[PDB]
């Protein structure tokens with residue numbers, strides 16, 4: 001049947017995690033530092049643990065979702081041997097270095113450790129819009145995927161054994177989001193000088209975004225190969241259009257810092273001999289500090 | 290019946306335009322500065338004009354596709370009485386300023402003017418994959434829509450009456466492309482430090498991209514209303530994640546200039562008083578030089 005699970009942390013997001021486990025039929029034990037945040041869950045069937053030690057002893061799967069890594073260790077460091085044989089899933093926001101250090105710490109204490117990144121707001125937990133990324137030993141993920149997937153039934157993803165991968169993928173994916181939104185908003189500013197409503201630009205911008213998803217998968221093998229054929233446009237052609245975008249921005253009185261930055265990066269690739277390479281050659285500029 | 294059409298310029302793209310008109314059954318007159326580029330078009334029924342003047346006299350719809358605005362200028366400027374009653378469609382890459390000047394110039398010579406932006410490679414002309422954006426007086430677009438759509442049968446769009454709109458839309462849409470691709474390549478660099486192959490990141494990055502296409506249309510009403518509710522994250526929350534991405538880049542030895550620039554832009558918005566606004570508030574600083 002459903003695995004027993006413990007949730008440590010009943011903030012907005014921890015509470016949503018515990019509610020999802022309970023609604024899916026798991027025996028759910030909950031704990032929070034400050035009393036008074038567990039009684040609705042208890043009334044729905046959760047076990048209100050009397051202490052951290054009881055909570056951690058209650059289930060082989062311990063999901064932690066608190067403010068930061070300092071709080072995680074305030075809760076878990078005083079435990080003496082309680083973690084041995086258990087699987088710790090840390091959904092607290094942290095860095096890749098914190099996750100890798102936590103993996104070593106947990107291994108010393110006999111626990112399996114998965115670091116997770118929640119790509120969702122609390123209200124979207126257990127919906128098809130949620131994504132949760134996991135990293136750490138695959139055997140622990142496989143053992144508990146049936147339980148963990150109730151938090152993101154169409155979005156539960158194991159990335160690999162390096163515990164730092166979740167944090168890094170989360171940030172990398174947000175980078176794509178910021179790139180899209182900046183392009184939309186800068187474009188909306190540019191077109192706004194000609195009276196164009198952002199809602200008139202948006203369907204074209206959204207379709208472009210969808211099209212460029214295919215460019216992403218097309219570029220990946222070139223990155224891995226270190227070989228960057230021009231395909232449909234050399235970096236020279238890209239850079240010229242970048243220059244044009246900057247010059248139109250300056251002429252029309254909107255901010256040109258974004259296209260000038262794009263042009264800077266492309267120019268560094270051209271300076272290293274990639275005038276006739278495809279856009280994927282810019283990966284070499286991103287690897288260099 | 291299919292309108293007679295003239296194509297000026299038989300480079301890689303002009304040749305594809307002429308071929309498409311011919312295949313669709315239009316009487317097609319062609320001209321190129323250098324002879325010997327129209328043999329196959331002529332075998333297919335193209336009428337080879339001996340001069341620009343003869344070409345413009347042959348058909349009321351004149352499609353121009355040469356290297357740049359200087360070339361368009363050298364072809365058009367000697368024409369006076371020849372242009373009366375014609376509709377000039379300029380598919381040459383150029384600036385919004387040049388397009389607006391060309392519209393006014395043509396109108397004083399008795400000719401209608403549409404500026405166009407080809408978002409396609411030559412081999413995709415006359416396929417469902419092609420996109421062609423047009424701008425200029427709508428009466429001319431409507432008069433020749435049946436002819437023009439042969440070039441992009443599922444992707445022809447008239448943007449508005451301002452002749453400069455096509456150039457601006459093309460560049461704004463490319464800005465979105467560069468945003469996605471830089472986000473992907475920076476992410477690939479960052480994850481590369483952990484041994485992640487770009488092809489293993491790519492499915493996640495592409496899924497992200499297709500999801501964020503929906504964020505674009507969600508943001509448009511906020512831009513048009515000048516109202517920027519936080520939604521799922523205030524600018525403070527965005528900026529903190531941006532800083533995290535920069536710090537991970539720095540600590541892992543890859544380039545951090547992109548996340549630091551993202552941080553700069555978001556901080557520009559926060560300094561205007563938008564700490565608690567949503568991301569669409571960034572449009573305001575994109576409007577400011």
Ligand SMILES: NC(=O)c1ccc[n+]([C@@H]2O[C@H](COP(=O)([O-])OP(=O)(O)OC[C@H]3O[C@@H](n4cnc5c(N)ncnc54)[C@H](OP(=O)(O)O)[C@@H]3O)[C@@H](O)[C@H]2O)c1
Nearest residue numbers: 009010011012013014033034065066067071092093118121
């Ligand atoms: N949209 C989101 O909310 C979202 C999305 C993705 C990830 N996350 C992550 O989820 C984690 C929790 O966020 P949240 O929204 O639930 O935050 P929250 O509503 O502020 O709750 C924070 C939780 O951390 C606990 N905590 C703080 N300091 C502690 C300590 N020293 N010892 C023990 N517990 C401590 C709090 O306990 P008390 O009740 O005793 O204060 C509470 O359970 C964060 O790392 C957050 O970044 C949140």
Ligand SMILES: NC(=O)c1ccc[n+]([C@@H]2O[C@H](COP(=O)([O-])OP(=O)(O)OC[C@H]3O[C@@H](n4cnc5c(N)ncnc54)[C@H](OP(=O)(O)O)[C@@H]3O)[C@@H](O)[C@H]2O)c1
Nearest residue numbers: 298299300301302303322323354355356360381382407410
């Ligand atoms: N993928 C693409 O190719 C693509 C995509 C979108 C837009 N475009 C745009 O389409 C336009 C043409 O590109 P293309 O690929 O066809 O370039 P191309 O193969 O280099 O052909 C350039 C054409 O311009 C003509 N030309 C140049 N200077 C001239 C002048 N001073 N007087 C008369 N004719 C002149 C050339 O005539 P000669 O043969 O006599 O040299 C030739 O017909 C450009 O503005 C380009 O940016 C191209």
